[PDB]
Amino acid sequence: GAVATGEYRNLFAEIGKSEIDIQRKIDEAFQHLFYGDAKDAAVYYQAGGNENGPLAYVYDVNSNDVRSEGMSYGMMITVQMDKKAEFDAIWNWAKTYMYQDSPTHPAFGYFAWSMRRDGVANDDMPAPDGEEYFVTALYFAAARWGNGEGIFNYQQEADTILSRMRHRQVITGPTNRGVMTATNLFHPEEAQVRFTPDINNADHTDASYHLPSFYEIWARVAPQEDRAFWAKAADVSRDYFAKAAHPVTALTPDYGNFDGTPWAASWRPESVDFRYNAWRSVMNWSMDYAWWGKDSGAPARSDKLLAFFETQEGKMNHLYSLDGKPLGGGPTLGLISMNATAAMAATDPRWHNFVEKLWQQQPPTGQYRYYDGVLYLMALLHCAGEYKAWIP
Ligand SMILES: O[C@@H]1[C@@H](O)[C@H](O[C@@H]2CO[C@@H](O[C@@H]3CO[C@@H](O[C@@H]4CO[C@@H](O[C@@H]5CO[C@@H](O)[C@H](O)[C@H]5O)[C@H](O)[C@H]4O)[C@H](O)[C@H]3O)[C@H](O)[C@H]2O)OC[C@H]1O
């Protein structure tokens, strides 16, 4: 794997792009999404400052609300791109406004998944892949830049947040939504990330939240007493993808049960299909295979997923049944982007076409550019050999 050798595949170079052009492409993506026109192009906003210096956020320009996912992806993008100033400003906002620091609040130790631009939470509860990316980006920051103090002691922040994700106790108390009860963020016996710590829907998962590539990082650098647990989670996730992905198409559902079966959320029964969450599953397993070389099923799974999307050429939807029936929409940049990241594991040379397809895109504009854009920029970095394990 790339971590052992230090050699990350440059998939764009493999399909014949020059390094000058690859650098232009990444830089254009970043400049547009971070510093482009505020109404049509940018998803990053500078929001004054406080005692820790500048504040900024990545946000869903559609809803006009901040998402913990977007903040955490912002941090990952910026650390990968060596953009410390933007990283610190995003982190300052997440830690200042999103992080729940009251030990009697049921979201204690978690980041509000949905928050308004003035810091008013829409929902105090987390979207746990936010936490997963926050912790990992923080470890990467420590590696690349060294640790600061206070909230910029990135390694100490990561250790605390991660320990609490495993060891959080059950807490019942007041929130913006009424009295709620929440637990830990990983199931202690299953060693799987939860879809939610809310006790009413806690015993479920989401394939797109499984990040064995990052669990391996935590297995190396987390507090000692948790390293075996994280190592176990990495094995468990590799098995999870093998069970959860359809055996013909490799499509996964948005939401899932611990045993690998789809889960229909009461408020969103269509979660059993391949939708906006599940786009990312192939990135997660392909990244894991590229870095660590342990998911022996990842190459065949990525081959199957690309073989399926090849049958959709010219009639591309972005919502599918797991067996491959189109359920609506047209092509999206976010799905193009994630499908290109399959090439981190794929063996069949059709992967060149999917990488080429990502290469041909422009940065997103208009109302849906946040989710399309953060997926786009992450996929550009993976495909350029610029998204690396920075181990402290
Ligand atoms: O129930 C709560 C959970 O929902 C919560 O999870 C978080 C929110 O949901 C997930 O992230 C969101 C995924 O959906 C995105 O919305 C759209 C989806 O469509 C994308 O593509 C468009 C499709 O249509 C085309 O016409 C158009 O051109 C395309 O761009 C669009 O780009 C997206 O913006 C949201 O933006 C994401 O935030 C994820 O699980 C969590 O972030 O967790 C708590 C739980 O209580």
Residue numbers in the entry: 5 to 396
What do the study authors state?
Here, we have studied a potential GH8 xylanase from the shipworm symbiont T. turnerae, the genome sequence of which unveiled a treasure chest of carbohydrate-active enzymes. We have shown that TtGH8 is a single-domain endo-xylanase with six catalytically relevant subsites that hydrolyses X6 to yield predominantly xylotriose. CAZY GH8 enzymes act with inversion of anomeric configuration and thus feature two essential catalytic residues: a base to activate the water for nucleophilic attack and an acid to protonate the leaving group for departure. Intriguingly, TtGH8 shows the highest activity on mixed-linkage β-1,3,β-1,4 xylans, which may reflect a genuine biological adaption to, or at least an accommodation of, these marine substrates.
